[PDB]
Amino acid sequence: MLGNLKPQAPDKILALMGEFGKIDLGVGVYKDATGHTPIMRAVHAAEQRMLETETTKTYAGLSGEPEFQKAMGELILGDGLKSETTATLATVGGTGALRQALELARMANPDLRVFVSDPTWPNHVSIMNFMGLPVQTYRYFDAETRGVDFEGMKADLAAAKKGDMVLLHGCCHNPTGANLTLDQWAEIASILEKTGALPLIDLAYQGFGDGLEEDAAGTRLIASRIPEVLIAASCSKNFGIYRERTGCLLALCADAATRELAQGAMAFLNRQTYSFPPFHGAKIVSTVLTTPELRADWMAELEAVRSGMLRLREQLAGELRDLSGSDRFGFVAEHRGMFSRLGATPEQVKRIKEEFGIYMVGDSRINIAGLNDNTIPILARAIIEVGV
Amino acid sequence: MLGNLKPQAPDKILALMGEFRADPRQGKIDLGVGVYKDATGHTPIMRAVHAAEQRMLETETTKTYAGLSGEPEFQKAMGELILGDGLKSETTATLATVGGTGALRQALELARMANPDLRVFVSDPTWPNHVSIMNFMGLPVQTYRYFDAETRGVDFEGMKADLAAAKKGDMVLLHGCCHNPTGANLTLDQWAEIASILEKTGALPLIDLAYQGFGDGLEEDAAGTRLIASRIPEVLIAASCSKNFGIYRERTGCLLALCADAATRELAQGAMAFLNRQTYSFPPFHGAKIVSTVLTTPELRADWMAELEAVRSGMLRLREQLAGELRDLSGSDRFGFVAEHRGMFSRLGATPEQVKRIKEEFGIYMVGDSRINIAGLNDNTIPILARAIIEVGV
Ligand SMILES: *Cc1c(COP(=O)(O)O)cnc(C)c1O
Ligand SMILES: *Cc1c(COP(=O)(O)O)cnc(C)c1O
Ligand SMILES: O=C(O)CCCc1c[nH]c2ccccc12
Numbered sequence: 066m067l068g069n070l071k072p073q074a075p076d077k078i079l080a081l082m083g084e085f086g087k088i089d090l091g092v093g094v095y096k097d098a099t100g101h102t103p104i105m106r107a108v109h110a111a112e113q114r115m116l117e118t119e120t121t122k123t124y125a126g127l128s129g130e131p132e133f134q135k136a137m138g139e140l141i142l143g144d145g146l147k148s149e150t151t152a153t154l155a156t157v158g159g160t161g162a163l164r165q166a167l168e169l170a171r172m173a174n175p176d177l178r179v180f181v182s183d184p185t186w187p188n189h190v191s192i193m194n195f196m197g198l199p200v201q202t203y204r205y206f207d208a209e210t211r212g213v214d215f216e217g218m219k220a221d222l223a224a225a226k227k228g229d230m231v232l233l234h235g236c237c238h239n240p241t242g243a244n245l246t247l248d249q250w251a252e253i254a255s256i257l258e259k260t261g262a263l264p265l266i267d268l269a270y271q272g273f274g275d276g277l278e279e280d281a282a283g284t285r286l287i288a289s290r291i292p293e294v295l296i297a298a299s300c301s302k303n304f305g306i307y308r309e310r311t312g313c314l315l316a317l318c319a320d321a322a323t324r325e326l327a328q329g330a331m332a333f334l335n336r337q338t339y340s341f342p343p344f345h346g347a348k349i350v351s352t353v354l355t356t357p358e359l360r361a362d363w364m365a366e367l368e369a370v371r372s373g374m375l376r377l378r379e380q381l382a383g384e385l386r387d388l389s390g391s392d393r394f395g396f397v398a399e400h401r402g403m404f405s406r407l408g409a410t411p412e413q414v415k416r417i418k419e420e421f422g423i424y425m426v427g428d429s430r431i432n433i434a435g436l437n438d439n440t441i442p443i444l445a446r447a448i449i450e451v452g453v
Numbered sequence: 454m455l456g457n458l459k460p461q462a463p464d465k466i467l468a469l470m471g472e473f474r475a476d477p478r479q480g481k482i483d484l485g486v487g488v489y490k491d492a493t494g495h496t497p498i499m500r501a502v503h504a505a506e507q508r509m510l511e512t513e514t515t516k517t518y519a520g521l522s523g524e525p526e527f528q529k530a531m532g533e534l535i536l537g538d539g540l541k542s543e544t545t546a547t548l549a550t551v552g553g554t555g556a557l558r559q560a561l562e563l564a565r566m567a568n569p570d571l572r573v574f575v576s577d578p579t580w581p582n583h584v585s586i587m588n589f590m591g592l593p594v595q596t597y598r599y600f601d602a603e604t605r606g607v608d609f610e611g612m613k614a615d616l617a618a619a620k621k622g623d624m625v626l627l628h629g630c631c632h633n634p635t636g637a638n639l640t641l642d643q644w645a646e647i648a649s650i651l652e653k654t655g656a657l658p659l660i661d662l663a664y665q666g667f668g669d670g671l672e673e674d675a676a677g678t679r680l681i682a683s684r685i686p687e688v689l690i691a692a693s694c695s696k697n698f699g700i701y702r703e704r705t706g707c708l709l710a711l712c713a714d715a716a717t718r719e720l721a722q723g724a725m726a727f728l729n730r731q732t733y734s735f736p737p738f739h740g741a742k743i744v745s746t747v748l749t750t751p752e753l754r755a756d757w758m759a760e761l762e763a764v765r766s767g768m769l770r771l772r773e774q775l776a777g778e779l780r781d782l783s784g785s786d787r788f789g790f791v792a793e794h795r796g797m798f799s800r801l802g803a804t805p806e807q808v809k810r811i812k813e814e815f816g817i818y819m820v821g822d823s824r825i826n827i828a829g830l831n832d833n834t835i836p837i838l839a840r841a842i843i844e845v846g847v
Contacts, residue, residue: 066622066657067687067712069567070720073727079521094517102517116506123488123496124701127464157551157733164732173454188734195731228454263454293455307518308738318455326458333461337589338558339551340582343737344702 078187081424088423088444090435093239093403094307095273095370098437105305107363111352115345124341128332129155129313133347136354137313141268141298143278145285152316152328154335155342159269159299159312164192165334166265166295166314170230171198172330179265180222180231182206184428186239186267189232203231206241211396211408213243219256227261233287235296236280237270237402240430244274244401250283254290264291269299272367273374274401277303292319300350302403303367311346374403377433377441384445397433404430413451421447473818481816482834484825488701489764489797492831499699501757505746518735522726523549523707527741530748531707535662535675535692536682546710546721548729549736553663553693553706558586559728560659560689560708564624565592566724574616574625574656576600578800578822580633583626583661597625600635605790605802607637613650621655627681629662629690630674631796634824638668638795644677648684658685663693666761667768668795686713694744697761703740768797771830778839788842797827803847815841 081091094102128134134153138146156162171177179198181189182205193200204217225231233253238244245253257264264287271280287294296315301307316331318324335342353359378397385394397405407429409417417423423444425431436444466487473483488496522528528547532540550556565571573592575583576599587594595618598611619625627647632638639647651658660678668674682688690709695701710721729736747753776792791799803811803823811817817838819825830838 066564066567067710067721068717070563070717070724072720073723076730082518092518102515104513104516108516112510116503116510119498121496122498122502122700122702124695157737158735161733170454173457188730192731301518306516308516308735310733310735310737316455323456323458326460327455329461329463330458332464336464336582337586338732339555339704341552341702341704343551343704343739345737345739 076188076191078426081426085424086422088421088435088440090423090425090431093302093432095302095305095374095403095434096432100435102305102307105363105366107353107359107366108304108306108349110359110362111349111356114352115348122344125344126155127335127341128328129153129342129347130344130351132351132355134313136351137298138315140277140354141271141281141296141315142285142288143281145288147317149321150318150324152318152324152331154314154316154328154331155347156312156314156335157339157342158301158310159267159297160188161310161342162297162299162312162314163189163267165331166297167192167196167198168334169314169316169327169330170263170265170295171196174228176228178229180225180229180262182232182234182238184240185232185234189267205238206243206406208408211243211406212399213245213249215245215249215252219252222253222256222262223260225260225262229260229262230265230295231257231262232265232267235266235268235271235284236274237404239269239402240404240406240426240428242400242402242405245283247282247286250286254287257287257291264294266294266296268296270302270402271298272303273371273403276371277364277367288317291317293317300346304346304350304353304363306346306349309346309349310343311350313347374434377436378405380438381433381436381441381445384441385448388445388449403432403434405433407431407448409448409451410453413448413453416451417447421451423447469818469820476816478816480837482818482829482837484817484819484829484838486826486829489696489699489828490826491828496701497699499757499760501747501753501760502699502743504753504756505743505750508746509742519738520549521729521735522722523547523736523741524738524745526745526749528707530745531692532709534671534748535665535690535709536679537672537675539679539682541711543715544712544718546712546718546725548708548710548725549741550706550708551733551737552695552704553661553691554582554586555704555736556691556693556706556708557583557659557661559725559732560691561586561590561592561624562728563708563710563721563724564657564659564689565590568622570622572620572623573659574619574623576612576626576628576632578634579626579628580661599632600637600800602802605635605637605800606793607639607643609639609643613646616647616650616656617654619650619654619656623654623656624659624689625651625656626659626661629660629665629678631664631668631798633663633796634798634800634820634822636794636796636799637790639677641676641680644680648681651681651685657687657689659689659691661691664696664796665692666697666758667765667797670765671758671761682711685711687711694740698740698744698747698757700740700743703743704737705740705744768827771827771835775827775830775835775839778835779842782839782843798824799827800824801842801847803842803845807845807847810845811841814844817841
């Protein structure tokens, strides 16, 4: 029977990971000056604290722990958190929350269509294809200016009927790195409430753009305006606990009645999939967020990560400028997040991986955290050498 | 939109524990609990487990993304634990999952991918989650007799007849050991026979192995699984570490795909990793690493097996005690089955009325299907429970 199985398409971003003088600018993971993904101080402290306090590992909360649920809602929504109308579900990472979000939405409406950005995180369309959900794409990346094509984005979103779901990256847009301004978000909220489309926010990099609170500004704006909204959050990157698999889905409802419905359908979704969600990561997050001392060191470390990356983008931008006599590459200092689209065509892209030895996603997506004073110049010369 | 959601039913556990707490009675007892509890009424962390976390706390340098299908050390270690020397790597595909329930879910998704017209056969009765997951997936479900309400043993003759109707490509779900909820198990000779019916029909066996080490022993409890694995070309094993390792909340388990050849192993393995990725990407690392650490570290492994054995011996003694107490009170060996049963659960075979009489009159709580948890018993509770069973006319 199993011999009837057909080969499935692999994840290209992870493919590189398997392949990899070598300069890894692929997989979205923050790397320090020495090409290492460290365990954040607070997280390590939380783990030690946990080792001493836990007395049992019996089954716990089907929808996650109350503490985790509370800490997360406040992290994301701040004072906009109206628990009375919000349902929370702890999931297996942010990816798990996306699937759980699509399942919930489909339960609510069989004839659901999902709009995604052009381009977008490949795993989005994958999950959607797998589910057999109709996917449409709104314009987003302004190819020439390397920025956002907002006029085109608005045009497309306006065509979305109600019951349709629109997927927005809350901040640090993967892969482009190009993002919407708060003003643009208000504009988008206007279209959304006028079309009745349900927004699904993918919040995977809160803290890597402009700051914890500022990276959630757009999400908080949609939440303050649109009566119903779904937010899929990931703690893999901002807490640096990628392998623990921890995140959650937040369902914002118009009232408590619908809230009790969503909460019941969210938990049932976990039960029919894998029972309880993993505890260790959610516990690390809960402990960090509710312990003043630990949240303080965590915020500080993330801020350092954030600032350093911005500092690097600035370098690459400067290197290229003084290494070409032009400013076509100014977009690097303008982008926010971990990634940026170099714009490089597939031919050059491939060449650099072979002879030069640098690994970047086939669409020229570069994880800037993989660069430094040592590799930046070589990279600049590399793109010149590989031309366009 | 979310208002069109048909209200989903709660896990029932809540209504069970809710009523138990409402009871003002001093000496009320709870045998409905689904987890292991020691003398103190606690669910402890195993010594070997707590030691593994300490080691991990000192050696883990990073938490970057790891294996999409699990870490080699884990998959390998699990396969050897379940299949022993018979671990035929070349033809084995493995998948780290979110608990055994994850393993079950993925196994079902895998089978349905290879055979759309898949039909599943489950025992009568079986772990309610089984049915729920299949009903959710929209999979046809057929029952096969199993628990004999009269003898509290296995209606093997009935099981045989019902399984003979399986077609080529259907899935037959079997409990590897310690049947939940009944406690009634198959003898290796009965396993041998079931294997013949499977070869004959060509039905794919999905073995649920969640209590290895809680019946007769690690090796013994896997004998059934190993028989099936040696005689059937394609076998699917859904294992759990939640109970025998005491890491219920860490969500650790794995699916083992046993195939006819290597090319198939390649197809299965790929389809397995694909399933993870479309569900939650990478599987939860923490509990899996605790398991691999214990199993690969002689010092820990020894201590772990030692603790599991003590637990197994302790539960068995409680069984013998209950049976003995029941023999003195009834003047017969009518309830001897309590001593033949294996695992931490046993279905007494009491009707709902009787289950309700016991609660109202004796303050003893249990699942409506009269499933009790052996670990909940002790020198003080046993007498009471025995008296109640007898007094209610069971
Ligand atoms: C990282 C990431 C996620 C979530 O990853 P998990 O490790 O599953 O938490 C979701 N969306 C995007 C765009 C991401 O980059
Ligand atoms: C415990 C158990 C499982 C696995 O559960 P997880 O908690 O997800 O590890 C599967 N089947 C049965 C019958 C069980 O008792
Ligand atoms: O690099 C990125 O795009 C995100 C980080 C890596 C990553 C996390 N989850 C995944 C699922 C599929 C493919 C890649 C991933």
